[PDB]
């Protein structure tokens, strides 16, 4: 089914296949009505235009609410397998089989075009009811098939005789390809083919004289191979329109990003383009660009990325230079270059001002904090602080925003969570973001919906309620990840959770080998801290504490200056408490623990107070004053069982007191 | 299929990374272990892959094509590309640059140039430089900065030229001078330049100031090592360089002291062990290969008899590199370093060999009892020294059967036959370990293993019959021992103190029995030295609390170093600092050992002004009704669509109604 | 409230406008023929002009839009905060009884199997609530695409000079969403009052 | 090479633009074509707060004019005006006086800038 | 693209609170006449991208009457000093 691929502005052999089916359905002489599902799979890919930006937008509208079958490749083998599935589909498939055998010439092709335009197609419904004398079904221009057939008819009167000669040469080439297939052998004889074929071949006006040499003109042109064939220019094996090719690739990249498809067939045909279709169809370059990221190729990806932005910018009359730089900046952020992306992005702001268009700045401003969210350590380098943006976007407008406010409030929530603000304000801010996301469609905006789940699981896990976290955890999508943050980030993140499980299960050999991978991999900041935190916990288990104690405080010191992450400042703090008291010297931690107790009492996070409570009771039991620790734990025993992951530490202390 | 490359980068010790080449010279993958990092594809043939530095302190991976070089910044920055005057045969890395060899001949006529075929470049943008040679393909070059020997072999002559290359920076960049020469064996016949170079193998080894070069040829089983000692006086001599005269004593060529030197499969350098140790692979059958260890400088060799059949391939080198064990924890490293600093290199290298053997036997014996951790290496450490000190039991004894595998090894026999080393070195090891235990006693975060040492050291004393004072120093209540009294920091510190009933006593540290500068002692026991100096300065009769900040600053003591002390030493100094928390208000430098932010911030402001750097603004932690759901959404949708100065004015002027009246 | 005020009045309006006038099974085949071919029978033109007309069409959109946009509000602003609060209280409910099972050390114990059932059941509802909220989001997308086309068909039948503003070329998969709406609104399962949400569950 | 230097200069990569211009200088076949690069190269050092280093390049660009029997080109006019201004801050008025006189054949603003500088240094001479 | 107003909730609150130059592409330039093609309406500009089929369809529609419109104006037969453009002009006046 493979062959050279070429873009054609004329009647592809695929287009006539739909034309064959619509003729049978409208003729109503055979009583054969094509199922509505068959038409919706064939014509719909041909419908014009879907559009797809490289990045900055993921499946904003491309996602179909109802799952759709993949578009069908232009091979007679693939089209039949659609009709063939039905028990009576052999009747429908044979109808197409007979017609494709009936059309042995270009004049016959013209017969089909003339029949549809004069009788079948109808200008408007007002003449439909006055055409009750028609023995065939009639179609309106504005209908689904009507607008399709009008374009096909327009696409037929547009070319010269050179256009029609190429029509018939390829179809016979297209037809004879299916002849050398196993499926054709199963349909070698079907008696119904002769019946349907003879229905249209009648009224030939000659059967004695012209048909002897009518055969001669075709056979001589065809490759009988008795002698050397008549020499002709190389002809493409498959012809596809721009719109049909757009639907296959868009489905392929979406399917690759996250009824069976043919990845092998689509990729081979797309590799045989004549280098002029790629200019008329720039999206072929990016199809390599997504593939290039998969194997993590640096030089290959950049040439494809640059190539896609040279062809797209000129075709679109609007200025798109202000979009190319940030996307390249996005690509730079994907390979953890970070600093190189900053210089590239900076020049994007200057070009946007020259255009003097307001709508693009919001796209620029949204990209700002998305990059800072992945890499919070660069918040100082920007010319605008993160708090400035939130104040601008909150009062941005009252109309024509839709998703801007949904974006605006989530960034405030991350900063408030990092700033260890009061839990009353964090819940209210998160409420603002949850209400605006779910108000509109959450399915189309898959990216923010996943980010809601990630925050809410993180927010409630921080509160200490795993029961709530578990419900939302089943909705967080895996391996989906997000744009501008690598491509193997999902694999690494899944690996971190395995390592944490291995520490609990005392698989010290596994974690030790993984820590070797940590020091020479390029990791996102959120991934850095976890492995940075993982290294601290592993060293505590081993028993060596001089290195870990000198190591943990440098982390927290740079966890307060480089990034003002309070949550990770707290989480790092308690291991040092655990390191001290495990070494039979926890009194040094008494000044440190109390500063956090009254500090977190004002905040009101119950998980924070109780964890400090366990460390306080544990301090008091290693000094020789376990009497009052029992009294203190007894009054608060009711409120400390509400948190599941501390019960194991809580229950274990109970047998010690006994 | 992918092929691994042996040496890629000069990183004065090694780098964690791998390079994969495709079946043809068209792809380079910087995979770490199994994750495909930056991948580069090229139409031309790829010669080599880099990651070297370029004298500007970069961390860049460089790939050289036939006539074009790509320099991709990995640590920071983008990518660069440079051209070359002519075609390049091969490229060899050296410290801060690359050496490029011209393509000699291609077709089949064979013609080549000899006047100048080598190019030196430091960084991509700067122009190239020319080599300098004074009284010929470069087979190998000293890529590592530490080693300084280059080997040259000229084809027809079949002789080697050993030089002493020294790097010249800010055109002649490198200079070479001949020292000696070696004649290849007649049986060695070399016939595609890389394929000719492929058969011959060379390695770079270094210990202290001695260097050895390993020349190996598998088809003819030819193996020799050329050694030189880098004497600072001889090398710096002007006649030595230009004239090339070299004393004959320094130059020496010798073979390996192995059982079957003619049956060696292949050898590699131990990446994990920085010293002279070299991997040796030997085979006795087509399905079994025995691996052993040998040291070039000291004739000590390690009997290991490790069997590995499928690991002999090149692409499987890292696993083989991970085959032999080294202590990967943080405790026995200092013990091994102390042994190294107090024992001869031969005893040292034999000790790692015996410890590795003992480590392997215990891993085989221990069937994953509970976890396996620091106790593993400590048991290896303790049992190796015990066997060294305990007389060998009779063959019928049960203890003989359990540790038979260590007894028959040649090194353990030799390490027990040598009467001199057992006579004097072992007390030194015990004293060094006792000082290590004492050093741990000052770090409270590590009492556990502290106590551990105690047990073994007790055994050591029980083995040696030292005076009961040493043995009783551990209870709550035939070599010659040099020290009659155990040296203790705490005893000496109480000695250097006011109102000290005990008389004056010195700590008699090991800086004199190590015969090495105090710099080496500093990196092993910093806490002991820090505390000794600090209480040497504080208890002076002319001491004031003001200078304590300068002493702490000069002694590199930080907040963490202060919070880790087993009471005692800790108690006065906080209070001393506490005293400084009251009367100190004049900004007298080095405020960071304090915990007051205002003084350190003003000092940072002043230092910026004096220099003419982080003006970290303090975020106002502002803090009440919670209201309802509907009100919050209405408020945000509503907001969707001088005051402080006036407040200051109400505070700038007060106590009267003059301002309102005048307005 | 939603079953009585939002769900039932919308479905009864659909049933009265469709089943008592034209019928369900018959209506579905003609619209697909109308969608694909534009064939309007004499009876169908009566249904568009007399049964539906302009007056009910605006009511249909108004009844339909409130049937979805108000439905999404009550699931997120009531069910989601409430579902969190029940699970919050049950966990505190479980902790307190467990504590006096230890603090008192009383011989008789009260089984905790009753609390866990509520905990798992409460967890089930919240997961089940979120499935509906996403599903109603898709329903909103299908709802709008149907009436924007149905607006075109209705006015053309009553005007004969209507200028079609909307174009099918805007969306590629416009056909699938349009047909999928018919199956949901016109089917045996659709006839049931639980067509909007699974009220019985 | 000169164009590459401009792109680096315009993107805030002053450390790289320095090395780029030095390579361009060597490739130039005639010295006179290096007059334009020298003045811009001196400016980049001025942005790299080290005024002493840029003096040596200011010597070369000015000295090319003498080696070319008085080329008197525009980009050397700015060289003499800047060089004389700095020499006033150095306190050497005599060494600055001749620089103003030699550049007295430039633009309308160039001649007046040197003329007033000539009067200032003559008074302190 | 709900514009914050297609949301019923926030739309409800607001009521209560109240109380393009074109540049040619490379394919646009044609071979025969150095004048580039100028699209007639914004419908032929697909999201700023010129539809090659649609533009070439208009080109065929333009050239088609041009063959029939050949004889108008300049062409003059022998024996008749008046062209057929005003043959139909006076013919139009004849009946009217």
Swiss-Prot record, chain B:
Record's subcellular location: Nucleus; Cytoplasm; Cytoplasm, Cytoskeleton, Spindle pole
Organism: Saccharomyces cerevisiae (strain ATCC 204508 / S288c) (Baker's yeast)
Signal peptide positions (record): none
Subunit structure: The APC/C is composed of at least 13 subunits that stay tightly associated throughout the cell cycle: APC1, APC2, APC4, APC5, APC9, APC11, CDC16, CDC23, CDC26, CDC27, DOC1, MND2 and SWM1. APC1 interacts directly with MND2.
Encoding gene, per UniProt annotation: APC1
Family in the record: Belongs to the APC1 family.
The protein, known as: Anaphase-promoting complex subunit 1
Functional description taken from the UniProt entry: Component of the anaphase promoting complex/cyclosome (APC/C), a cell cycle-regulated E3 ubiquitin-protein ligase complex that controls progression through mitosis and the G1 phase of the cell cycle. The APC/C is thought to confer substrate specificity and, in the presence of ubiquitin-conjugating E2 enzymes, it catalyzes the formation of protein-ubiquitin conjugates that are subsequently degraded by the 26S proteasome.
Upper lineage: Eukaryota, Fungi, Dikarya, Ascomycota, Saccharomycotina
Comment field (misc): Present with 178 molecules/cell in log phase SD medium.
Curated annotation (Swiss-Prot), chain C:
Cellular localisation: Cytoplasm; Nucleus
Keyword match Nucleus: yes
Cellular-component GO terms for this entry: anaphase-promoting complex; cytoplasm; nuclear periphery; nucleus
Swiss-Prot/TrEMBL keywords: Cell cycle, Cell division, Cytoplasm, Mitosis, Nucleus, Ubl conjugation pathway
Gene Ontology biological-process entries: anaphase-promoting complex-dependent catabolic process; cell division; protein K11-linked ubiquitination; protein ubiquitination; regulation of meiotic cell cycle; regulation of mitotic cell cycle
Keyword Glycoprotein belongs to the record: no
Role: Component of the anaphase promoting complex/cyclosome (APC/C), a cell cycle-regulated E3 ubiquitin-protein ligase complex that controls progression through mitosis and the G1 phase of the cell cycle. The APC/C is thought to confer substrate specificity and, in the presence of ubiquitin-conjugating E2 enzymes, it catalyzes the formation of protein-ubiquitin conjugates that are subsequently degraded by the 26S proteasome.
Assembly and oligomerization: The APC/C is composed of at least 13 subunits that stay tightly associated throughout the cell cycle: APC1, APC2, APC4, APC5, APC9, APC11, CDC16, CDC23, CDC26, CDC27, DOC1, MND2 and SWM1.
Note: Present with 1332 molecules/cell in log phase SD medium.
Name of the protein in question: Anaphase-promoting complex subunit 4
Species this chain originates from: Saccharomyces cerevisiae (strain ATCC 204508 / S288c) (Baker's yeast)
Lineage: Eukaryota, Fungi, Dikarya, Ascomycota, Saccharomycotina
Gene coding for it: APC4
Residues of the full protein shown: 252 to 452 of 652
UniProtKB/Swiss-Prot annotation, chain D:
Residues represented out of the complete protein: 502 to 626 of 626
Primary gene name: CDC23
Functional note: Component of the anaphase promoting complex/cyclosome (APC/C), a cell cycle-regulated E3 ubiquitin-protein ligase complex that controls progression through mitosis and the G1 phase of the cell cycle. The APC/C is thought to confer substrate specificity and, in the presence of ubiquitin-conjugating E2 enzymes, it catalyzes the formation of protein-ubiquitin conjugates that are subsequently degraded by the 26S proteasome.
Location in or out of the cell: Nucleus; Chromosome, Centromere, Kinetochore
Protein name: Anaphase-promoting complex subunit CDC23
Post-translational modification remark: Phosphorylated by CDC28, which is required for the early mitotic activity of the APC/C in its CDC20-bound form.
TPR repeats: 1-31, 35-68
Family: Belongs to the APC8/CDC23 family.
Membrane-crossing residue ranges in chain numbering: none
Subunit structure: The APC/C is composed of at least 13 subunits that stay tightly associated throughout the cell cycle: APC1, APC2, APC4, APC5, APC9, APC11, CDC16, CDC23, CDC26, CDC27, DOC1, MND2 and SWM1. CDC23 interacts directly with SWM1 and binds the destruction box (D-box) of the substrate cyclin CLB2.
Misc remark: Present with 80 molecules/cell in log phase SD medium.
Tree of life domain: Eukaryota
From Swiss-Prot, chain E:
GO BP terms in the entry: anaphase-promoting complex-dependent catabolic process; cell division; deactivation of mitotic spindle assembly checkpoint; mitotic sister chromatid segregation; negative regulation of anaphase-promoting complex-dependent catabolic process; positive regulation of protein autoubiquitination; protein ubiquitination; reciprocal meiotic recombination
Keywords for this protein: Cell cycle, Cell division, Mitosis, Phosphoprotein, Ubl conjugation pathway
One GO CC term, this protein: nucleus
GO molecular function: ubiquitin ligase inhibitor activity
Homology family: Belongs to the APC15 family.
Role, per record: Component of the anaphase promoting complex/cyclosome (APC/C), a cell cycle-regulated E3 ubiquitin-protein ligase complex that controls progression through mitosis and the G1 phase of the cell cycle. The APC/C is thought to confer substrate specificity and, in the presence of ubiquitin-conjugating E2 enzymes, it catalyzes the formation of protein-ubiquitin conjugates that are subsequently degraded by the 26S proteasome.
Record text on subunit structure and interactions: The APC/C is composed of at least 13 subunits that stay tightly associated throughout the cell cycle: APC1, APC2, APC4, APC5, APC9, APC11, CDC16, CDC23, CDC26, CDC27, DOC1, MND2 and SWM1. MND2 interacts directly with APC1, APC5 and CDC23.
Name of the protein described by the UniProt record: Anaphase-promoting complex subunit MND2
Source organism: Saccharomyces cerevisiae (strain ATCC 204508 / S288c)
């Amino acid at each position: 089914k493979y062959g050279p691929l070429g873009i054609t502005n004329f009647i592809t052999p695929y287009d006539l296949c739909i034309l064959i089916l619509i003729h049978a359905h409208c003729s109503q002489d055979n009583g054969i009505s094509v199922p509505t599902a068959v038409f919706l799979r064939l014509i719909s890919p041909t419908r014009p235009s879907l559009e797809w930006n490289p990045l900055l937008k993921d499946n904003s509208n491309l996602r179909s609410s109802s799952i759709v079958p993949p578009p069908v490749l232009p091979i007679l083998d693939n089209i039949i397998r659609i009709l063939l599935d039905d028990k009576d589909g052999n009747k429908i498939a044979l109808t197409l089989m007979g017609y494709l055998e009936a059309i042995n010439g270009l004049d016959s092709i013209n017969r089909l075009m003339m029949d549809l335009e004069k009788n079948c197609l109808v200008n408007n419904y007002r003449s439909m009811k006055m055409r009750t004398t028609s023995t065939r079904r009639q179609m309106t221009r504005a209908s689904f098939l009507g607008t399709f057939l009008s374009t096909c008819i327009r696409k037929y009167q547009i070319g010269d005789f050179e256009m029609r000669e190429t029509i018939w040469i390829n179809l016979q080439n297209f037809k004879t390809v299916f002849k050398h297939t196993p499926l054709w052998l199963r349909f070698k004889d079907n008696v119904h083919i002769q019946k349907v074929k003879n229905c249209l071949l009648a009224n030939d006006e000659i059967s004695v004289e012209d048909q002897q040499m009518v055969e001669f003109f075709q056979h001589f042109n065809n490759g009988n191979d008795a002698d050397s064939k008549t020499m002709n220019e190389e002809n493409y094996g498959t012809l596809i329109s721009i719109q049909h090719l757009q639907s296959i690739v868009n489905r392929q990249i979406v399917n690759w990003l996250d009824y069976e498809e043919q990845s092998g067939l689509v990729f081979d045909l797309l590799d045989t383009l004549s280098l002029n279709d790629a200019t008329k169809f720039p999206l072929i370059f990016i199809l390599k660009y997504l593939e290039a990221i998969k194997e993590n190729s640096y030089q290959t990806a950049l040439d494809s990325l640059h190539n896609y932005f040279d062809y797209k910018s000129t075709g679109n009359s609007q200025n798109y230079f202000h979009i190319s730089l940030l996307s390249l900046a996005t690509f730079h952020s994907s390979f953890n270059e970070c600093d190189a992306a900053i210089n590239s992005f900076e020049e994007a702001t200057r070009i946007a001002r020259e255009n003097k268009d307001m709508e693009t700045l919001n796209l620029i401003m949204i990209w700002i904090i998305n990059f800072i969210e992945v890499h919070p350590e660069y918040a100082n380098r920007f010319y605008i602080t993160v708090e400035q943006i939130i104040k601008y976007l909150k009062n941005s407008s009252d109309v024509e925003d839709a998703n801007i406010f949904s974006n605006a409030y989530k960034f405030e929530t991350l900063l408030s969570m990092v700033k260890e603000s009061k839990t009353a304000e964090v819940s209210s801010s998160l409420l603002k973001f949850m209400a605006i996301t779910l108000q509109n469609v959450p399915s189309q905006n898959f990216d923010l919906f996943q980010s809601l789940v990630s925050y809410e699981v993180k927010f409630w896990k921080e509160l200490g309620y795993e029961s709530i976290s578990d419900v939302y955890e089943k909705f967080l999508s895996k391996t989906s990840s997000s744009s501008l943050r690598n491509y193997d980030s999902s694999i690494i993140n899944q690996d971190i959770k395995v390592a944490f499980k291995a520490l609990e299960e005392d698989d010290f050999l596994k974690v030790k080998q993984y820590l070797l991978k940590s020091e020479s991999l390029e990791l996102d900041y959120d991934q850095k801290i976890n492995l940075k935190y993982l290294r601290v916990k592993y060293l505590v288990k081993i028993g060596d504490y001089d290195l870990s104690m000198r190591l943990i405080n440098q982390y927290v010191k740079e966890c307060c200056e480089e990034v003002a992450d309070s949550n990770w400042r707290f989480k790092f703090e308690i291991e040092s408490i655990n390191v001290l008291l495990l070494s039979d010297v926890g009194i040094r931690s008494l000044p440190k623990i109390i500063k956090l107790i009254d500090e977190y009492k004002e905040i009101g996070n119950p998980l924070r107070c109780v964890i400090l409570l366990l460390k306080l009771c544990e301090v008091l039991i290693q000094v020789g004053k376990s009497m009052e620790a029992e009294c203190l734990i007894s009054c608060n025993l009711s409120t400390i069982l509400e948190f599941p992951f501390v019960r194991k530490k809580t229950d274990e202390l109970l047998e010690s007191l006994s | 299929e992918w092929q691994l490359q042996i040496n890629i980068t000069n990183k004065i010790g090694g780098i964690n990374g791998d390079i994969w080449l495709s079946r043809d010279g068209r792809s380079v993958k910087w995979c770490i272990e199994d994750q495909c990092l930056r991948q580069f594809t090229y139409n031309q043939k790829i010669i080599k892959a880099g990651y070297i530095d370029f004298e500007k302190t970069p961390d860049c991976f460089v790939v050289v094509l036939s006539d074009i070089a790509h320099v991709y910044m990995l640590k920071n920055g983008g990518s660069t590309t440079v051209c070359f005057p002519f075609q390049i045969g091969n490229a060899f890395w050296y410290a801060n640059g690359v050496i490029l060899e011209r393509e000699t001949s291609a077709s089949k006529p064979i013609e080549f140039d000899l006047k100048h075929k080598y190019i030196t470049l430091t960084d991509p943008m700067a122009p190239f430089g020319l080599i300098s040679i004074t009284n010929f393909q470069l087979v190998l070059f000293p890529s590592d900065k530490d080693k300084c020997i280059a080997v040259f072999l000229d084809r027809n002559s079949k002789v080697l030229r050993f030089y002493y290359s020294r790097i010249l920076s800010s055109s002649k960049d490198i200079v070479l001078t001949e020292i000696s020469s070696l004649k290849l064996p007649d049986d060695i016949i070399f016939t595609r330049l890389s394929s000719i170079l492929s058969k011959l193998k060379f390695l770079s080894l270094r210990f202290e100031r001695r260097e050895g070069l390993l020349i190996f040829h598998e088809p003819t089983h030819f193996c020799k090592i050329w050694l030189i000692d880098l004497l600072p006086d001889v090398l710096d001599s002007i006649p030595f360089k230009i004239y090339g005269n070299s004393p004959q004593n320094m130059i020496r060529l010798e073979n390996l002291k192995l059982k079957e030197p003619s049956r060696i499969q292949a050898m590699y350098i131990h990446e994990l062990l920085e010293s002279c140790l070299i991997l040796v692979s030997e085979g006795q059958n087509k399905e079994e290969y025995k691996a052993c260890l040998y040291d070039p400088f000291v004739k000590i060799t390690s009997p290991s008899k490790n069997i590995s059949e499928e690991l002999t391939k090149q692409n499987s080198l890292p696993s083989l590199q991970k085959l032999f064990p080294y202590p990967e924890t943080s405790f026995t490293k200092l013990c091994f370093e102390a042994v190294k600093y107090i024992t001869s290199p031969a005893f040292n290298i034999s000790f790692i060999f015996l410890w590795q053997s003992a480590y392997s036997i215990l891993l085989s014996r221990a069937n994953d009892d509970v976890v396996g951790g620091l106790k593993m290496e400590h048991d290896a450490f303790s049992l190796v020294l015990s066997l060294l000190i305990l007389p060998i039991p009779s063959s019928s004894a049960q203890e003989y059967q359990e540790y038979k595998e260590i007894y028959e090894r040649d090194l353990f026999q030799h390490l027990k036959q040598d009467s001199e080393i057992t006579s004097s070195v072992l007390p030194r090891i015990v004293i060094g370990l006792h000082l290590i235990r004492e050093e741990y006693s000052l770090n409270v975060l590590c009492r556990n293993e502290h106590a551990l040492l105690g047990q073994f050291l007790r055994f050591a004393t029980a083995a040696m019959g030292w005076p009961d004072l040493w043995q009783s120093y551990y209870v709550p209540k035939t070599f010659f021992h040099p020290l009659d009294e155990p040296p203790s920091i705490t005893k000496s510190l109480y000695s250097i103190t006011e109102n000290s009933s005990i008389p004056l006593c010195p700590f008699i540290s090991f800086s004199r029995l190590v015969a090495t500068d105090t710099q080496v002692e500093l990196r092993i026991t910093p806490r002991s030295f820090k505390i000794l100096g600090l209480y040497e300065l504080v208890h002076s009769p002319n001491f004031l609390p003001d200078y304590v900040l300068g002493i702490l600053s000069s002694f590199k003591v930080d907040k963490d170093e202060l919070q880790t002390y087993p009471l005692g030493i800790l108690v006065p100094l906080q209070n001393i600092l506490k005293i400084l928390e009251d009367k100190l208000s004049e900004v007298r430098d080095n405020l960071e050992l304090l915990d007051r932010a205002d003084l350190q911030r003003c000092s940072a402001i002043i230092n910026s002004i004096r220099s003419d750097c982080k003006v970290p603004l303090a975020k106002n932690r502002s803090s009440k009704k919670p209201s309802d759901i509907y009100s919050i959404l209405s408020e945000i949708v509503k907001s969707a669509s001088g005051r402080s100065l006036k407040l200051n004015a109400g505070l700038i002027f007060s106590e009267d109604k003059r301002f309102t009246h005048v307005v | 409230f939603i079953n009585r005020e939002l769900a039932t009045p919308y479905l009864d309006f659909v049933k009265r406008l469709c089943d008592e006038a034209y019928g369900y099974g018959k209506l579905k085949s003609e619209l697909e023929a109308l969608f694909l071919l534009g064939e309007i029978s004499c009876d169908l033109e009566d249904w568009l002009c007399n049964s539906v007309g302009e007056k009910n069409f605006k009511r249909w959109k108004y009844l339909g839009c409130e049937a979805y946009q108000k439905t999404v509000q009550i699931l997120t602003l009531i069910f989601v905060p409430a579902c969190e609060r029940i699970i919050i209280y049950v966990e505190k409910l479980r902790a307190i009884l467990q504590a006096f099972s230890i603090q008192n050390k009383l011989s008789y114990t009260s089984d905790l199997t009753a609390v866990e059932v509520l905990l798992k059941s409460s967890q089930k509802l919240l997961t089940m609530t979120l499935n509906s909220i996403i599903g109603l989001g898709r329903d909103e997308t299908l709802f709008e695409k149907f009436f924007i086309w149905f607006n075109d068909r209705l006015h053309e039948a009553l005007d004969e000079d209507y200028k079609l503003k909307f174009q099918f070329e805007d969306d590629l998969y416009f056909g699938y969403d349009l047909l999928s709406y018919f199956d949901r609104i016109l089917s045996k399962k659709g006839t049931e009052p639980s067509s909007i949400i699974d009220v019985k569950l | 090479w000169q164009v590459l230097g401009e792109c680096y200069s315009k993107t805030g990569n002053k450390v790289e633009a320095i090395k780029c211009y030095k390579r361009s200088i060597k490739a130039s076949q005639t010295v006179d074509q290096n007059t334009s690069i020298y003045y811009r190269l001196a400016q980049l050092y001025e942005e790299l707060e080290d005024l002493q280093e840029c003096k040596k390049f200011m010597m070369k660009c000015v000295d090319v004019e003498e080696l070319l029997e008085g080329i008197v080109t525009d980009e050397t006019v700015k060289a003499r005006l800047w060089l004389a201004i700095f020499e006033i801050k150095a306190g050497n008025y005599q060494l600055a006086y001749d620089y103003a006189m030699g550049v007295s054949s430039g633009t309308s603003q160039e001649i007046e800038e040197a003329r007033m500088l000539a009067r200032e240094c003559r008074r302190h001479m | 693209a709900r514009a914050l107003r297609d949301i019923s909730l926030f739309n409800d609150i607001r009521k209560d609170q109240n109380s393009v130059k074109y540049i040619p592409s490379l394919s646009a330039y044609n071979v025969f006449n150095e004048f580039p093609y100028y699209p007639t309406s914004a419908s032929q500009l697909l999201d700023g991208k010129l539809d090659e089929f649609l533009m070439l369809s208009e080109q065929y529609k333009s050239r088609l009457p041009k063959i029939r419109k050949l004889g108008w104006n300049r062409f003059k037969p022998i024996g008749i000093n008046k062209t057929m453009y005003e043959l139909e002009m006076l013919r139009s006046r004849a009946r009217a």
